[PDB]
Amino acid sequence: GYDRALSIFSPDGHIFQVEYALEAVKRGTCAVGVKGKNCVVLGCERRSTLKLQDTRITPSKVSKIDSHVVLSFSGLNADSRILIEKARVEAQSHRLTLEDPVTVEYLTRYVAGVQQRYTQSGGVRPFGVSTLIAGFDPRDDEPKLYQTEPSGIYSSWSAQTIGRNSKTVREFLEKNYDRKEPPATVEECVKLTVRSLLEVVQTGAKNIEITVVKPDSDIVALSSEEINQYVTQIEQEKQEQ
Amino acid sequence: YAAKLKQTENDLKDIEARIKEKAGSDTGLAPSHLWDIMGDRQRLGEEHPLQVARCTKIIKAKYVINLKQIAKFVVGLGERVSPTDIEEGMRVGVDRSKYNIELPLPPRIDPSVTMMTVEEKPDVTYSDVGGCKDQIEKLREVVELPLLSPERFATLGIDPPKGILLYGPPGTGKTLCARAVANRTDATFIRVIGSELVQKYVGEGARMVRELFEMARTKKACIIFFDEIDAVGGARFDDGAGGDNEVQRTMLELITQLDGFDPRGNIKVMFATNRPNTLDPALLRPGRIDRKVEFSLPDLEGRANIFRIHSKSMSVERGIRWELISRLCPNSTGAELRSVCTEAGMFAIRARRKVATEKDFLKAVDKVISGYKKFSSTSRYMQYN
Amino acid sequence: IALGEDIGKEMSLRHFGHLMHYGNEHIRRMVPLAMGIVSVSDPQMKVFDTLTRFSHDADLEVSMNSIFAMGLCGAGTNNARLAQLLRQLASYYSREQDALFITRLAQGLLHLGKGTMTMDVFNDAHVLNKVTLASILTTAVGLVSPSFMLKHHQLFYMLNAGIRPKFILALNDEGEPIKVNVRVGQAVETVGQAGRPKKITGWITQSTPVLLNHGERAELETDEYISYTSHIEGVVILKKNPDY
Amino acid sequence: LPNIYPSTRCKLKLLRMERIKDHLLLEEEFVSNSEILKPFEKKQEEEKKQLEEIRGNPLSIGTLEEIIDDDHAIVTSPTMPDYYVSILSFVDKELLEPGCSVLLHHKTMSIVGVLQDDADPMVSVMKMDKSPTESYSDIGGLESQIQEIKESVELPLTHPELYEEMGIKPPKGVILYGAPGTGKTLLAKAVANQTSATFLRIVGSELIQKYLGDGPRLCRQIFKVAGENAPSIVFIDEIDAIGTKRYDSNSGGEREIQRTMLELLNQLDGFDDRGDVKVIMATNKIETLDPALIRPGRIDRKILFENPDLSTKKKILGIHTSKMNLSEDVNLETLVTTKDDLSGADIQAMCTEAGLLALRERRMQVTAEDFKQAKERVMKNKVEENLEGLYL
Amino acid sequence: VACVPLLPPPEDVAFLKTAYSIYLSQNELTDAIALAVRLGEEDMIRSVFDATSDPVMHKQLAYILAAQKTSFEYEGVQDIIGNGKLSEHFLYLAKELNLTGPKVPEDIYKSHLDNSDSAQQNLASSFVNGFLNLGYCNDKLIVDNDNWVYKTKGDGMTSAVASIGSIYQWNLDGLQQLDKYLYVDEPEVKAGALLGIGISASGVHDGEVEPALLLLQDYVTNPDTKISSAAILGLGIAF
């Protein structure tokens, strides 16, 4: 039906649709992820403009693609869960075709490929989402964290954040996280992720959601009564020092 | 002690008032004098009041005079002017009583066409413009060379091109390259902004252009800088409602003046625009525009030259890498490089450092080129070109 | 005589104006110099406009005196406005080569030492630099007949006797400069104010050596680095106060 | 006369005005002696008598048109036939700008003076003649934006030494783009408060005139007036008005607006090389602006304004409720510092509404109930938002 | 202290002395040295010096009176009062403000932007260059161009070489550069170099033996009016 090209090379070389999707992502909720020796933590915030949103049926910001690999996004929430559905069905097809649980690298490559194709195909605007992929490969304990941009470029990050005010979280991670010396415990990773969030969220312990990913098919979602527990000693150690 | 203070303050005002009164908005300068009382000698000569009036048909001798609105007298000479010095269209200083043709006067020019004549030669030079060597060479060969050394054009027996376009993306150097010409020339440089040629009453733009061209022809060598001709540049088109037909009328009057039933007369004219696409093909036709310069985005060497020109001043730290700064700034017009230099200077001031270093320039170029990218002009107007 | 309190300065301005109104031609070609010596190194706005007025006037010697008074008035301040005026006068007084030469001398004096040195007669705390005043009077005494110094221009180096740098230098106790924040603003007198009012209006938080123009003082923003000398001008030595 | 220090009584003060009187009397004595020495028959104040008798009466008023062959000119009075008036020596030949108002003599009609306009029939409204009110203290937060605006518009005028030493021309113009009701106008009021320059405000609507001609005419007049009264801080506001709206009173329609915008984009940069005319525009919709205006070299530092955060909200509450007849029952900590979204305009609007409500009850003190009622009143009278649903 | 300029004399000296007495009893010598310089009593400055035991205050008072160019003799301090550290301070200033790069007199003229006897214009350019690079000890117009001096004729040659001494002011290094022009047989060149010798050490006084005095004293008695005039002018400038 619609064959008109929507992504056209600008006279300065950039693609206007892709660089507009960059800003569309820049207005999304902040999402941050860090990795330890054997633990990767995906931290995220929620919108506090409106209240009376329950927790049980509210769609989780971090969506489970498989038992060993999880995904978190930022930006336009509408389009991101489509990528989630495509990634899940592709993972099942990969299980059928290769008799092997999917790897983080392959899934991230597929997501970058589908975003690239939508930037390529005519009549379709590029995705306005930016995704974070975390998990553990089968029989491997190494946490892998991957970021996928709407432009289609993917890279590994020891600690990356996306969304609004991502510059502040980036510079915070640039000095309170060491790439060569990652935190050695799940508690330390969670504490770093939480302390990173208060630099932007500035209250909102109710709408701070954190997912901890562990090897051997272990994915947990810390509830509020533990997040506020971490926040207690974090704010206790903040002002007194 | 305030009992002293009272008359201490009183004396100030009293004495200043006394001095102002004793020494004694609309005058010249008494300290400069020059207002001598010999003016009675140049005052008793009641010939100073001279009715102005435009002469008309020369009855073979009797002259018909058309005093603006007092009368339409028919008058002879006044013995102070040769009989061949008066011709139809000239303005005559008609005598007040027993009217006579005393003194011919320069043709009437509209005041609004007078201040559009630069007598305050701007502060730029050809050294300022960088990364546009070929374009500046073409501009020279069109505008400056024919007046400076016309002997060669006589030896070859050719007519140098009279008329040159300066199309390009905004903030590339068009107005700068016209200001440089204005500074480095020796001929009159009548400047015309495109919007100024849009008056209210119908047909006034045609009079504007006609009087402007007459004034230009009055001088031996003149350069006209029709600028932002995008304003009066609309291609001829019909829409039923007669849309903006007055601007079209002004544009056709200009086209006829440039090349009509009468040669131009050494009136080399420079145009300049940011959207040359919307120009009527008649203007683009050679004869009124010969060369079409292509002021465009500079290359890496152009960027380096721009940085060197705009950083001749400034307390730059020795050892800065201008090549690296130029490379990390792709497809940015020279105005953005100037803004980068200004912001690099500013960032040092905010940190109180009296010398801006490379680490400062990198931050400034990141902030300006990357941060102020959504508000960029060189990406839309390039399509129009 | 009026080159004492600035109130006498301002009154002497009007004195010279009135004398220029009613004055014979020999006294005409010094009223510029009268403005210049009185207002040296501080290019106040109301000084050089009348000088410009008398620069285009007749009695070519008067014009030469006016431009030299500009040069003295703009001594070391790098005033771009007065530099533009001097360049314009260079364009105008180009036919007479003597006027061009004295104009170029005024240009050179305008940007003396690239702006790090001045002809200021009296410094902070109103000390009198007798050498500077001596040099200024030496160059102004006989220039009522400027052709004399046009012939014998060797006396134009007399300004180098009364010349001095104009800067701050936070010398360490051992004798080396050390960076420190210096508060620079327009000077204000502490006469009728009570308590501990500030001596600076319009402060700039400027670092180590700066160039305070005629009419500004200095004071240490930092609590530490106690200066032994209260008047922060010229060379200044500092000590580390243990507080904070 | 000079200024007098110190303010209070002091013997040195008395000495200062003693010097004042001494010098004043000395000028008076010098002028008296000089006059007495002069030949009164052509000196003293007989010059006034000669000027009056040569001038004649009454002096008519006309318009100059040319200065051909100085000592000669062609005036054009509204009714006279445009005489060939000669220029007398009393007039200053430097103010005879073509188009001025000369003073013709009654009978012989020779120019005996130039009448300066000094009218400003429309500029007087434009010319900022009394500082509005708020200083920079009244703006809560926004420290970065204040710093940028200061170093762009204030420091070049008050403190040019840093810029001339550094060797950079100051950033020409600044555009304050941001969300509506966030202090974009307050900051202009603040920079107008402390200023040593004329502040000619203009709003983009007034450039959308009705006649074809008077679109660029107004802009040319505004920038000429800014130039002559240098330096100038012209504050074109609601600059997006030219783009949108499409007013029926505009005869040209879109084309006249385009010509007006072209004249603006020229006058900002110009071939004329104007001097110290700083330009500060502010708009809600930066998107609908032709990028010629916002191009670097015309307005360099594009300051972004953002809705206040919780700490900024509490600071705004504190500064705006500083002049409150507040009862202790009102708690500022939980007053509006709720994190449920506000703006720089809401905080003042609810204060105004609560003050009005307290006035209605004639209660001189403010109750927490009234503050809460005004809070909810402001909340209902609020077009919430549209784009949040995309990310909701 | 503000009473002195306006208050009628001879009570001004009484006010100065009383304020000096107040300052000395309070150990605030920073202003006291200034009032002493206003009064001009050398024994009073000596008493200010004897009121200080800390050497640092001695150095700072030395700096103040050297800025005042007043020859007060004190042992162990003579370098500072002799203005011998001014040259190093000024070259440090030039390095810190990045003003080391010399400016051409053409750069001052900017005649290239405003454009469509050679001896007098060369004299003006030499004067401008001498005023510009004063104290920075570096220039490109005259230092590297020896034929530049010959462009100026007559008295212009004197100021040409004098510009070098002006550029090397407060610096004893310049004596080497000025030395070469002393050997030129032309009397005007000798006079110009000899006059510039004094400027190169103007306001600089080492404690024991001033080289400018030693080199200058021989040429004072020269029968040439120009050479002797330059000698006495340099003597006045240096001291």
Ligand SMILES: Nc1ncnc2c1ncn2[C@@H]1O[C@H](COP(=O)(O)OP(=O)(O)OP(=O)(O)O)[C@@H](O)[C@H]1O
């Ligand atoms: N090649 C160049 N050399 C030096 N400066 C340059 C160059 N190109 C651009 N610039 C700088 O950018 C500006 C040149 O553009 P200018 O301000 O003259 O407007 P313009 O290109 O005519 O704009 P518009 O097309 O919107 O009318 C100047 O401020 C100048 O300093």
Ligand SMILES: Nc1ncnc2c1ncn2[C@@H]1O[C@H](COP(=O)(O)OP(=O)(O)OP(=O)(O)O)[C@@H](O)[C@H]1O
């Ligand atoms: N940070 C602040 N500190 C103090 N007052 C503020 C602040 N932010 C906003 N205000 C108040 O908001 C009121 C209304 O906002 P204002 O008129 O300044 O907004 P604007 O965005 O410039 O306007 P407009 O959108 O109508 O063009 C002002 O009167 C001011 O007192």
Ligand SMILES: [Mg+2]
């Ligand atoms: Mg332009």
Ligand SMILES: [Mg+2]
């Ligand atoms: Mg507003």
